[PDB]
Amino acid sequence: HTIGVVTTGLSFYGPSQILVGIERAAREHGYSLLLATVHEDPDEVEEAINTLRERRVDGIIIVAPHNSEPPVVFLSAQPPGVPTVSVDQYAGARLATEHLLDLGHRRIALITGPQDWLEARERLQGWREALAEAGLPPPAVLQGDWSAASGYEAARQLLEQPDFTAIFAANDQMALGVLRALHERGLRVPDDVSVVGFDDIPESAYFHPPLTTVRQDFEELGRQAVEQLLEMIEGEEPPPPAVLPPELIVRESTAPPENLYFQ
Amino acid sequence: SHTIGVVTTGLSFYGPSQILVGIERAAREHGYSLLLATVHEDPDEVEEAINTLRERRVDGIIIVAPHNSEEEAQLAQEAGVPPVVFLSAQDQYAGARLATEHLLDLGHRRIALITGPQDWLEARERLQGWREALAEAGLPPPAVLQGDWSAASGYEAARQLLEQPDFTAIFAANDQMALGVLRALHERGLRVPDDVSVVGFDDIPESAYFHPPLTTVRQDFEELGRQAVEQLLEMIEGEEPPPPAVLPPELIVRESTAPPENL
Q: Within 13 Å and on the Cβ side, how many CA atoms surround A48?
């Protein structure tokens, strides 16, 4: 029949790749997708679940962030009573900051998304604590809204006091903006400044230069959400809260801060 | 009931995503929910996408271009159960014509075209539009290759075109493909716009943060979606649609085009 999917705006490409993964596994089981989008209001998520239930939906998947206060499967970390399938956002942000630390970077600036995002502090903690174990004082942290515009605006703000050799952006779109700012001011990536992103949206392998980023397996995430929801539909206990490991994809946007041999 | 079905290209592609944003907003504001019928690789899926929306007793079907020009989309509109509204931007491709006139007025004579999948009638009609426009201007036929709207196919099509590097301008049917075009050229050591001019289509928010910033055709995708909902609702409830406020297509000139280096 139909699966209802609650998501943010389609301008966020990570979540958009989750919709592609949901659709592929749902189509494989004869299920259509019923789309409902929300915008920051926490009661919009609850109201969306109502409307989908009014429309005789067999199951609901919540891609949008919502701290939880037909069967339902959330795609973020919720209480253990709520069925979840999520990606370790803390681990992802550690692998990225530790990768930059391993290459010799010490001043790694962080550009996060909105801080109301439940796991945006889980990204901040992975970055801050990685610099903790390395015994380093925290560099600049700036705010974006998952858009390339804010990534560009955050990077030119960091460029006002250029005391950084790497930028970790909380998603690929913001990272694209970061690259734009650095290429405009004539700084080379990765020779002058390394950039690391989050999500592995298909476009990030074709940025200039190909972006090193933390891959959330959106396709597997959408697959596991449909599989858990389908078992609950056909009568089964909710499978345990599942957490997917993020992978760091190293491409061309990252290098040691200076040349290791010829300085 | 209280559900609108949409035959659409996949959410992986950001042109059709922007259109779906307007559809979902306008349908929710009128009490309807968006049910998805995604066409992936072949226009033969348009018939099956219509019957899948009919199987869920949807009140009305929106068929987004280029799927509306397919024969089984005309038949469903003639059947009228459930009512069917086409979404398209109606010479015939004024947006593309702006790209053509932009490249010609710069002096470009040898154009390379990276189109969408040629299986659709609109894609072949768009290709003929370029051919007729180039012939009327006294230009040789363009070099033509087929993408699949993804940045990968944009990158791969450009590399095959570069095996015959006689062109000075490339038009990419969407901005994602143009992103792969830029990377392929920068790998081959070609400068944009100095060696090769690149133009895209759809004004995706990331366009201004490509390297170089990408000249592109902006179409009012969101309003086109709202207008499709208000027209389908005239067929369902008899509700009078508001006055049409769709802005015409607009070429967004940036930094990706320049006169040909030849002369």
A: 30
Closest by CA to A130, choosing from A104, A98, A88, is A98
Q: Note whether A149 contacts B205, CB cutoff 8 Å.
A: yes
- What span, in angstroms and rounded, lies between the C-alpha atoms of B218 and B121? 22
Angle between helices A218-233 and A13-27 (to 10 degrees): 50
Cα–Cα dist A164/B11, whole Å: 36
Q: In 10 A of CB B135, how many CB atoms? A: 11
The distance of A8 to chain B (nearest Cα, Å) reads 11
Q: Pick B155's closest partner by Cβ from A4, A23, A206.
A: A206
- Output A232-238 pairs: Cβ under 8 A, ≥24 positions apart: A232/A59, A232/A71, A232/A73, A232/A83, A233/A58, A233/A59, A233/A70, A233/A71, A238/A71, A238/A83
Residues A184 and A237 reside in one and the same domain: no
Q: Classify strands A247-249 and B84-87 as parallel, antiparallel or unpaired.
A: unpaired
Dig out the tokens for B32 from the structure. 């309807």
Tokens 């009919």 found at: B54
Domain that includes residue A176, residue range: 89-215
Q: A229 and A197, same structural domain?
A: no
Give the method used. X-ray
The reply to whether B194 and B101 lie within a common domain is: yes
The answer on A61 and A93 residing in a single domain is no
Beta bridge partners of A32: A2
Number of domains in chain B: 2
Nearest to B157 by CA among B107, B115, B94: B115
Mutation target among B8, B11, B19 for the A interface, most CBs of A within 10 A: B11
Indicate if A144 and A51 belong to the same structural domain: no
**Which resolution in angstroms does this entry have?**
2.5
CB pair distance less than 8 Å for B152 and A206: yes
**Residue B87, H or E segment:** strand B84-87
